[PDB]
Design a protein around this ligand. Structure first.
Ligand SMILES: Cc1cc2nc3c(=O)[nH]c(=O)nc-3n(C[C@H](O)[C@H](O)[C@H](O)COP(=O)(O)OP(=O)(O)OC[C@H]3O[C@@H](n4cnc5c(N)ncnc54)[C@H](O)[C@@H]3O)c2cc1C
Ligand SMILES: Cc1cc2nc3c(=O)[nH]c(=O)nc-3n(C[C@H](O)[C@H](O)[C@H](O)COP(=O)(O)OP(=O)(O)OC[C@H]3O[C@@H](n4cnc5c(N)ncnc54)[C@H](O)[C@@H]3O)c2cc1C
Ligand SMILES: CC(C)(COP(=O)(O)OP(=O)(O)OC[C@H]1O[C@@H](n2cnc3c(N)ncnc32)[C@H](O)[C@@H]1OP(=O)(O)O)[C@@H](O)C(=O)NCCC(=O)NCCS
Ligand SMILES: CC(C)(COP(=O)(O)OP(=O)(O)OC[C@H]1O[C@@H](n2cnc3c(N)ncnc32)[C@H](O)[C@@H]1OP(=O)(O)O)[C@@H](O)C(=O)NCCC(=O)NCCS
Ligand SMILES: NC(=O)c1ccc[n+]([C@@H]2O[C@H](COP(=O)([O-])OP(=O)(O)OC[C@H]3O[C@@H](n4cnc5c(N)ncnc54)[C@H](O)[C@@H]3O)[C@@H](O)[C@H]2O)c1
Ligand SMILES: NC(=O)c1ccc[n+]([C@@H]2O[C@H](COP(=O)([O-])OP(=O)(O)OC[C@H]3O[C@@H](n4cnc5c(N)ncnc54)[C@H](O)[C@@H]3O)[C@@H](O)[C@H]2O)c1
Lengths: 444, 444
């Protein structure tokens, strides 16, 4: 009967849809801190570039639909500040009036996602210093682009948001610099594959500063410079994209177990250790198919999967989450960057004995016009030969190959079994042996 | 030590390479009727269109390479006319001098592939009436185009070659007509998916004549008209594109078992019923993963796989062929046409209880620019839900989806298991749920 969901996006609303469809007697209350439900965070960098007309295009399902069509009591501007899991009561503040509302539950779902991290640097609050998470976040970047003379842009963090936004700011015709604490950008990539990223950014005149630590943002009313341990550089707009943190702060005091980064531990059924409390999405842990422990790889695909499952499991339609593979894909200028399963640092960290194969080949028949380079790397166990991970980088046909590799990892295939799959071939799409199959043959 | 291989292309030479690499003592004789080894039949339609410079670009490995680098005794213009399996002797006739040569073997592989069928119509032999199989075939088609004023082109048979060449002739700026014996072109496609094919052809002004039967080709020294049961049409060049027959004729009188089509029956290890005789490629049968029966789906991916395997098995490096899935992919004008596993006709013929799901979707996030329609159909067992087959049609992202479906079929996945795979998502590549997963959700 009484279902409460905290967070009105991918994981939360996937759960809501499941409950609503499979229980007519259910009273669904969803509590969202912001004013916007079910939107596509993935489209943000492409709204900022101007490729998409507006942020309005990123709304998947508006609140009126949730209320009128599905009978969900979708609350906006309700921030949850406390949960009493014993009395089964959720306490929410109104973000404007600051008045306090309570919501009784039979089953609770926490789907509060993650927020971007802003390190405690001087000048972090200066105008023109931006994090990117939400539609308003994007609009505030658009405001800085609209109302100011922006020519130099500095990005802190050479990960997923930093890479895509480097494209966006290049496309908007800015002089882009990226500052990365670690040894290379695309840190989820092995050293040898990361080289391809550095070449592409270099080619488009993106200054990459590696092993460099930001100390302060300098400026008056606005940012005008970024100070590091190695120098001070003019900046008209600073994007901070240095990772994220689970929105699980408000749970301190509930006995709900979290891992070291604050992600809520869930079992196969999206259940926490506390009775009738569930979690899903970026705020939760993600059982890893290959690592065989609970990881934290916050991503939209996983969030919808976990959200859907949490909903079903809350209805007692028992269904286990099979896990993440750590898949990820990024468009970066002319390159597509794809990975899945284990990279070399993950395999090493786990003390799993592995070997690698790397093939430089083409996306399609070498004789065909506009066949393009494809760089493909695979990891596999030394003993059993079980496929462990893949990294694919190139201009075209990269998403295809990572999806096939993901399929192989999901099914725990040996690397040599790939040789046997009847994958498709015609000249405009592949070679008579797919690059994955050629790599598999090179394997021991 | 004495290995004899009949056929110098994909299946035959894949076998040759395995033997050569894994037995330094071996005497390999390969017997090829034509003059060209290891070439890409797949690139022929794209040579004729002018997209590829010449047929030279289609040679993967030279006979000179085979002889000098690998020490294979590669024979050209050697047509095998009979085999004595008791004496272990192969009889080859030189195609020019007509001289007969004997070759004794310890182990024999037959890799003679298939040949295009020319029905016994009047006018068969008129200049400008062409089959397409070989590089000389391609050259003859170009010879007609160079020396003859070609305006109207008529293609007989609306299968794989008819489809690709219909594009090739359109691109060369010709008026193209297609005449098909049964109800629709792309007969391997279900009626409902085939609609998309005749919409694309129509769009490009390709006349499709269905349930219509060629009666004769009319003309002087050269072809000038095609005659059917329904009319007579101007044609300056006729491509006959009506299917293929195994080149196994010369084995009559041996006890080597063939299926009804004349394809040579092989066990897991590419062995025929006759001691020390092996077969591989288009001339042999193809165990079907889903049908669980020996099929005949002649294709180059399978040919190379079977060839490689025959070579290994001939060396007593025992390895079973896992089967075909009947995967096929075609570029047709602006469409990519892909299928794998069972269609409805195949499932019905086998009396496997099945159901279907069809999704009209996009290749990538619906809000992203130039996201294109994607039409996707899946068949699955009504009882176990085992995935049985897929058909995918659209302008982009089709090869990706069919490869993923192929992976699912190879691993005998249930249709709903697809929902659980961590497939890649970013906006330029996919939607947060892949079309395959959305189809899977609709399934019972
Ligand atoms: C720029 C960008 C690009 C991305 N691109 C991709 C991509 O290409 N592919 C991909 O798979 N993923 C991508 N992602 C990630 C993906 O968008 C997220 O993984 C997904 O949104 C997670 O869903 P969720 O429901 O767990 O969390 P969110 O979507 O973050 O939803 C959590 C919601 O909970 C609310 N909330 C938080 N705390 C409270 C509280 N105390 N009380 C009430 N409500 C609260 C928040 O307001 C928020 O709306 C991208 C993210 C960004 C920022
Ligand atoms: C136009 C066209 C496009 C194609 N496109 C694709 C595609 O996109 N993707 C794909 O996977 N496949 C494609 N194929 C099919 C693919 O090329 C074949 O399946 C593959 O070549 C089969 O290899 P094979 O070694 O079994 O037979 P073949 O390649 O046909 O080789 C057999 C050889 O044996 C020789 N031979 C025959 N009889 C004798 C004899 N009596 N004595 C001595 N030698 C003999 C022949 O001369 C021939 O060279 C295409 C085919 C054509 C015609
Ligand atoms: C060209 C042809 C002889 C290829 O033979 P092949 O054995 O598949 O390929 P190669 O001879 O190049 O060797 C591949 C082997 O070398 C190894 N290898 C290749 N490159 C390597 C490298 N750079 N470093 C180390 N090893 C390598 C691979 O691991 C593979 O080993 P395996 O055969 O034990 O699995 C054969 O495909 C053919 O005749 N084709 C006709 C053209 C065709 O394919 N037509 C059909 C089109 S539809
Ligand atoms: C929009 C959102 C609510 C979608 O919820 P959803 O349940 O996945 O999708 P729908 O509500 O459309 O329902 C789909 C269900 O209806 C069924 N269905 C869909 N179309 C159908 C049709 N035409 N006929 C019959 N059944 C249909 C499906 O089989 C599916 O069934 P299941 O839920 O039992 O598997 C959710 O994804 C969301 O809020 N997302 C936020 C945006 C986002 O995804 N962000 C992250 C991007 S990185
Ligand atoms: N298409 C995609 O997969 C995609 C795209 C964009 C965003 N996202 C989502 O957003 C989340 C967060 O993105 P993100 O880029 O903020 O995190 P991230 O983990 O992708 O990138 C963080 C980067 O910042 C670096 N860093 C940390 N501290 C730093 C410092 N002090 N100075 C300089 N660099 C520092 C890290 O080394 C790392 O390279 C991802 O986990 C993902 O869920 C996904
Ligand atoms: N990309 C690819 O997969 C691809 C492309 C080209 C060729 N090929 C290979 O070539 C082989 C044969 O190609 P194909 O196109 O010759 O055969 P096919 O089976 O693909 O097409 C034959 C077509 O001819 C029709 N037909 C038969 N008799 C007819 C008649 N009397 N009048 C009119 N139509 C008639 C059939 O109904 C069928 O539609 C395929 O099996 C495949 O191995 C594959």
């Amino acid at each position: 009967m009484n279902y409460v969901i905290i967070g009105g996006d991918a994981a939360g609303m996937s759960a809501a849809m499941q409950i609503v469809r499979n229980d007519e007697n259910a009273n669904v209350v969803t509590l969202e801190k912001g004013e916007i439900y079910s939107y596509a965070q993935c489209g943000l960098p492409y709204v900022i570039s101007g490729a998409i007309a507006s942020t309005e295009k990123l709304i998947a399902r508006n609140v009126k639909t949730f209320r009128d069509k599905y009978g969900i009591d979708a609350k906006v501007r309700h921030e949850v500040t406390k949960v009493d899991t014993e009395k089964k009561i959720v306490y929410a503040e109104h973000t404007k009036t600051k008045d306090v509302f309570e919501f009784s539950y039979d089953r609770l779902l926490i789907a509060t996602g993650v927020r971007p991290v802003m390190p405690e640097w001087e000048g972090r609050d200066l105008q023109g210093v931006h994090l990117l998470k939400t539609i308003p976040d994007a609009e505030r970047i658009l405001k800085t682009l609209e109302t100011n003379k922006v020519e130099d842009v500095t990005i802190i963090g050479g990960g997923a948001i930093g890479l895509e936004m480097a494209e966006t700011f290049v496309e908007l015709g800015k002089k882009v610099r990226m500052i990365e604490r670690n040894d290379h950008i695309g840190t989820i990539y092995d050293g040898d594959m990361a080289e391809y990223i550095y070449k592409e950014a270099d080619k488009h005149h993106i200054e990459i500063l590696t092993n460099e630590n930001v100390k302060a943002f300098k400026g008056n009313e606005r940012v005008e410079a970024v100070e590091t341990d190695k120098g001070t550089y003019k900046a008209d707009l600073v994007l901070v994209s240095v990772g994220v943190k689970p929105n699980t702060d408000f749970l301190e005091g509930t006995n709900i177990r979290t891992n070291h980064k604050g992600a809520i531990e869930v079992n196969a059924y999206m259940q926490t250790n506390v009775q009738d409390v569930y979690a899903a999405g970026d705020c939760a842990t993600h059982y890893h198919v290959i690592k065989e422990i609970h990881d934290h790889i916050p991503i939209g695909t996983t969030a919808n999967k976990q959200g859907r499952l949490a909903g079903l499991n809350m209805l007692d339609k028992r269904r286990a989450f099979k896990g993440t593979l750590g898949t990820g894909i990024i468009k970066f200028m002319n390159l597509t960057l794809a990975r899945t399963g284990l990279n070399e640092k993950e395999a090493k960290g786990l003390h799993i004995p592995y070997k690698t194969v790397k093939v430089d080949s083409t996306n399609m028949a070498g004789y065909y016009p506009n066949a393009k380079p494809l760089y493909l790397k695979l990891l596999y166990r030394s003993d059993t030969k079980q496929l462990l991970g893949g990294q694919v980088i190139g201009e075209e046909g990269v998403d295809k190959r990572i999806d096939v590799i993901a399929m192989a990892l999901f099914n725990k295939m040996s690397i040599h079994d790939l040789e046997d799959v009847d994958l498709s071939y015609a000249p405009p799409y592949n070679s008579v042996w797919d690059p994955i199959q050629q790599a598999a043959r090179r394997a021991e």
